[PDB]
Structure 1
Amino acid sequence: GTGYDLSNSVFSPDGRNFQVEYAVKAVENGTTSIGIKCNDGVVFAVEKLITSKLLVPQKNVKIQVVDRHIGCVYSGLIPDGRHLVNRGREEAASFKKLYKTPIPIPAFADRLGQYVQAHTLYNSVRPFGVSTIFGGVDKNGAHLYMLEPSGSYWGYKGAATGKGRQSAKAELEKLVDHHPEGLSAREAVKQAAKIIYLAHEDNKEKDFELEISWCSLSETNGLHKFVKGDLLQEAIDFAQKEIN
């Protein structure tokens, strides 16, 4: 459908906002990132493609923390994701200043959804070219959400985005089938690494670095922390072992 896709706020005769649909095409080109909701927290994993050996390992972090209990991972236009996360940090700080409590994840997800959606209202602005998997632990459990360029978001047992989303979603579905009682935080980290490695088979042309993050009540006391050192290497070893 041409003619109606040159502007951001225009409905096509079918009611479809094409520019937002084109923004989704930007997301589908990004590196695959997933989020797994465990029985007491959430786990985030992102594939970081190694463009060249000259990138210093472990410095180009792509998972972001908001306040202290929300972690955000996104795929698509990385600058757009940072713009969205910068707003979330402002929204989270504003909520804490006025209400004194850390912003609830369902409340935070709405704050971001209103912002992302507001970018589809006017033709003087462009839609976000990122789908953001975000979540954390709040007063009433763990929450995992996923935004879209249109501003739509839902709660997920496990979310996947980026180029390997179709591959990753297959293994996320297997996790919920095999573990309906709830997956443990430590096992979720190992499974998160395995899913990213499997999803990378859609990007075999280039090497990648796995980055994991997670926020569990029992293990981080409800705060968002990165996987590093021994725990990261066990996940990498497990992911390679299953691949081999």
Structure 2
Amino acid sequence: TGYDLSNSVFSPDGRNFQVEYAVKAVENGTTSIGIKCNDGVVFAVEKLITSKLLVPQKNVKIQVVDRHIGCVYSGLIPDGRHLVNRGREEAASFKKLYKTPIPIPAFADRLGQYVQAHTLYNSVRPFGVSTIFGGVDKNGAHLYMLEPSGSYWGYKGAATGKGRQSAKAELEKLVDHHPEGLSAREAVKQAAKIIYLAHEDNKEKDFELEISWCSLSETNGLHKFVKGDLLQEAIDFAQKEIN
């Protein structure tokens, strides 16, 4: 009763309850996946068309940080955007002192340390977002997914949203089919497939698919949006597969 009320007070048995509660917010959000490839990394999110009044490709939820790190999130959608600010502030701060873009493992650590503060004190609220962010630098590609607790892990692939289960089982099967790492050029196509399957869950409102990629081979380490003809080939490929 009184451990339920409180923030940042340990339960008798030893767990924080409001970390657990903060997970709920991740499952309300829409699907998003990352796929780590041999070249770099692909990001993709399901953007729900909740009315005929929204405009197409103008209410983009994919947001870069610097010019080599893709970011898309699930949780509470204002609360996402403010962590994409925080990231920018730290990114930029590193470029002043050490004159080089920030390394991707380092980008992870400091971003995490912010989340961690809001479970240290009782006075601000534990952040209600699970994020995917990653990109390529000199060490290579890295994928990360950050949980509201303040924990990240590296991954061959990761996913988040209400349709995480349906993507997690295909993602094993894209570690079996291609055990040496598929090319990122193949993986535009493979990304679409995994959104079109995890849309039966959110089949309530029709969708619009968004991919983006950052890889050393294609885009010269510069994160971009897949657009025009390359976006048309991936759409028609996953649509005719799942029907």
TM category, shorter: over 0.9
- Give the match's secondary structure for 1:124: coil
Q: How big is the shift at 1:235?
A: 0.9
Asked whether the equivalents of residues 33 and 45 of structure 1 are also in contact (C-alpha less than 8 Å), the reply is yes
Query: In the TM superposition, what whole-angstrom CA distance separates every residue of 1:129-154 from its partner, at most 9, and x where no partner exists?
Result: 11001100011111000000001100
**2:131 corresponding residue in structure 1:** 132
Counterpart CA distance in 2 for 1:79 and 1:172 is 29
Structure 2 spans left out of the alignment, 5+ residues: none
Asked whether the equivalents of residues 30 and 163 of structure 1 are also in contact (C-alpha less than 8 Å), the reply is yes
Length, aligned pairs only: 243
Asked whether the equivalents of residues 135 and 144 of structure 1 are also in contact (C-alpha less than 8 Å), the reply is yes
- Give the match's secondary structure for 2:162: coil
Counterpart CA distance in 1 for 2:130 and 2:170 is 19
Asked whether the equivalents of residues 119 and 128 of structure 1 are also in contact (C-alpha less than 8 Å), the reply is yes
Q: How big is the shift at 1:127?
A: 1.2
Query: In the TM superposition, what whole-angstrom CA distance separates every residue of 1:50-93 from its partner, at most 9, and x where no partner exists?
Result: 11011000111111111110111111111111111110011110
Q: How big is the shift at 1:223?
A: 0.8
Query: In the TM superposition, what whole-angstrom CA distance separates every residue of 1:100-125 from its partner, at most 9, and x where no partner exists?
Result: 11111110011111111111111111
Deviates more, 1:10-19 or 1:97-106: 10-19
Q: How big is the shift at 1:11?
A: 1.1
Please give the TM-score of this superposition, normalised by the length of structure 2.
Answer: 0.98
Please give the TM-score of this superposition, normalised by the length of structure 1.
Answer: 0.97
Within a 5 Å distance, the mapping from 1:1-244 to structure 2 comes to 2-244=1-243
Counterpart CA distance in 1 for 2:167 and 2:233 is 20
Counterpart CA distance in 1 for 2:177 and 2:211 is 22
- Give the match's secondary structure for 2:217: helix
Asked whether the equivalents of residues 73 and 133 of structure 1 are also in contact (C-alpha less than 8 Å), the reply is yes
Identity %, equivalent residues: 100
Q: How big is the shift at 1:200?
A: 1.0
Asked whether the equivalents of residues 5 and 17 of structure 1 are also in contact (C-alpha less than 8 Å), the reply is no
Asked whether the equivalents of residues 8 and 20 of structure 1 are also in contact (C-alpha less than 8 Å), the reply is no
Query: In the TM superposition, what whole-angstrom CA distance separates every residue of 1:151-190 from its partner, at most 9, and x where no partner exists?
Result: 1100111110000011111111110111111111121111
Query: In the TM superposition, what whole-angstrom CA distance separates every residue of 1:10-66 from its partner, at most 9, and x where no partner exists?
Result: 111222111111111001110010000110110000001111011000111111111
- Give the match's secondary structure for 1:163: coil
- Give the match's secondary structure for 1:122: coil
- Give the match's secondary structure for 2:29: coil
Q: How big is the shift at 1:8?
A: 2.5
Q: How big is the shift at 1:6?
A: 2.0
Structure 1 runs, 4 residues or longer, greater than 3 Å off: none
Asked whether the equivalents of residues 8 and 121 of structure 1 are also in contact (C-alpha less than 8 Å), the reply is no
Asked whether the equivalents of residues 70 and 224 of structure 1 are also in contact (C-alpha less than 8 Å), the reply is yes
Counterpart CA distance in 1 for 2:126 and 2:207 is 28
Structure 1 spans left out of the alignment, 5+ residues: none
Q: CA RMSD of the aligned region, Å? A: 0.9
